[PDB]
TrEMBL record, chains B, D, E, H:
Organism per entry: Shigella phage Sf6
InterPro entries, alphabetized: Sf6_terminase (IPR048683)
Gene3D superfamilies per UniProt: Homeodomain-like
Name the UniProt record assigns to this protein: Gene 1 protein
GO molecular function, one term: identical protein binding
Length: 130, 123, 130, 123, 123, 130, 130, 123
């Protein structure tokens, strides 16, 4: 399939939503190749909008999946290394799929010299940087 | 079972709140599948909230789990590597489940050049 | 035991204070299961307050323990890897139990372009972000 | 083939935009070598732009590739190490190809001493 | 021995101040157990302070210890891994015992877009 | 060759531009040693300017090369470790050759206490830090 | 030796200045034990001042030493691991001995939303944080 | 040879400036030992400066060395580990020899809650 087919695009969104990766989806019977999916995306705003929603749902599904990949790892050195790689790749991807939810979280307690106030001295410009 | 139904959603929460993961909750008979749970959440703000607090309770349970996974690890190379992966995955997840509580903690002492005041020039 | 029992809650606080983990405490004779402890926490402010104090003390105990875990590690590859995991898990946990005391510590010397003053240029808003 | 020629440059872009890397594009018959592609870009701002969007499309393709590399890795020590290197290299590259999209994501909660207000003294 | 007693607390400090850890101090005859030492500290601000300076002295001793642990490590895989764990644990601990002295050190050169001035818009 | 030779300097710039390292270039027939190249740089602004341009081009070439080094790694433990080292060294170098293009990229969402506004309290100086 | 001896303290400063560690120095013939050195430090400002100077010099010596430890490492797995540990320990220590010289170095290019200006909105306090 | 002497110090600089390390420079006949070189620097500001530029030239040489160490590493486990240590040590050192040039490079896009403006309240 090369021509845009909304029924197929809808199915793609559903599968992605459930956690499946695009390349894996594109290997299913009657699915377009990844290049074609990207081509559809580029020219159909209805697909793009639903695909963005599916990406959010996809991330929520993957967040649950990482526990299973780790917990069910076959206790063999190479198998554990692969499980680790699969989990690390997902962790990285999740932060990009939904940065607000899955990005890193840090609380910075900001203090100044010797634990006192932050000391700031302002001066007029000394070079032409405007 | 696909139709959004309170009490059932209320059930799932109490389940997660007791430390149970979403997968296990959904593998129970009469329980909606993962996708259905998400669909619900997405279209109901009330469920989003109650689920959120269950998620914070789940985090508190996982926090204690990591000590046990580490301390009880089998002293075999692959098993220790697996335990480390299980712990690392939980640590990462906890920060997302309750960022204010389980996020990273840094104290930054901010000083200026040579430990003097921070020098700023403005236009 | 399912019903809240202050004598038992007090004992829990004492054991945690000494460095023992909750799941380990809950395996002792006559202790409630972890779910029950969390249930007690949720509905009894007297327990919650004493449990928070116990968590602070727990962290101070663990801070001493990490030296022992490392120093006494059996010099076998797997045993050292486990000791490392036990220590790393505690280090991570300590920062969350008492962020002010056990969080990361950084001193940032802040300077500007070419080691001079930090150069700032202010402008009126160019888009509607208010 | 060294002379800057639109349509050919337009071709390369569509090629990269479909996920193909620069090396492969340049190994095709009638295709300028790497150096020539760069020379072009450097002296033509129009090509720099179209190439930039092709680069963002290429990033989107690589983003999906990393899942497959990880999930389909052969369960052998050296092969898993190789797969990890392939993935790590792509992750690093993606942030440079589209920094706004694939860069690191952090939420910093900024507070002052003891969780009070941030204290500043100015001269 | 549970009753808070100066001179005994004064003793512990001088002990820690000479590089000795709390465990060893508490394993001595007539010495309060760990819990008792903490109880004391918690309810006495004077002890909290003297203990704090002993802790800074202890840090200075540990700082020199890490060189010896590294340099004298037995050239065997597991022993080197153990030495690395001993050193890493001490490095992490030192930053907490004296954050101003043993915390991380960074110099950040702050510049704006393209190395120009930092651009800010305010409402 | 010790005396500055523009034809040779031009060749050096071309080879570097294509991704080759300086020490490797300096092993080619009739090339000056690295010390000599640095000596030429120090005293000839025409060379320095063209060398800086070549460094930018060099980085763009290396950015493509890292994919090949990883993808074509011989699946042997030591060979993969070497490929990793070669890639890591290039990643580090690229950020210094063109910091704007190849430096790290972070988006920091800045918030204040409890996810509200960042709370700032200003006070008059309490010590003489001016 | 327990009593403070300036001649011995001077020697200590010289040895440290050259890169030697304190515990190693204290094993030399006729040297005080480390506890004694710290005791001397505590009560003699002349020693403390010269010891601080020696620490700066010590760091400069170690900075050169790390190259040698790495370059001369015996090509055996355990020996390389030990060399790495020796180098890593020194790197960490150097930043604390002279933070200005040997601390981490970062250049942060600060930009705002979508690569434009940093957008700041100020508001009156909404809670009592003063 | 302990007495501070220009031309000799000038010599050392040209030596370092050509990529040679301080150890090798000091192992040459008629060359002051390490300690003497430092003593000099400490008490002479002129030498501190000339040495500083030699140090920046030395950094530029080491920068090219790291490519060769990596690319020419012997494909044996311990040798690759050694090469990695040699490279890592040089990378770390370079940032200290010329921080503006070889320090870390980050671009931070600073935004506020939910990608809106950065919200500040002042007292």
């Amino acid at each position: 399939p090369s021509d845009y087919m909304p029924e197929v695009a809808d199915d793609i969104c559903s599968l992605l939503s459930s956690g499946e990766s695009l390349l894996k989806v594109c290997k299913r019977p009657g699915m377009p190749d990844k290049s074609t999916v990207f081509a559809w995306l580029a020219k159909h705003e209805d697909f793009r909008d639903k695909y963005a929603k599916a990406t959010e749902a996809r991330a929520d599904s993957i967040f649950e999946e990482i526990f299973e990949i780790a917990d069910n790892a076959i206790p063999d050195a190479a198998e554990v290394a692969k499980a680790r790689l699969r989990v690390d790749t997902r962790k990285w991807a999740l932060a990009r799929m939904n940065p607000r939810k899955y990005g890193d979280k840090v609380t910075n307690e900001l203090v100044g010299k010797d634990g006192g106030a932050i000391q700031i001295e302002t001066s007029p410009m000394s070079t032409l940087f405007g």
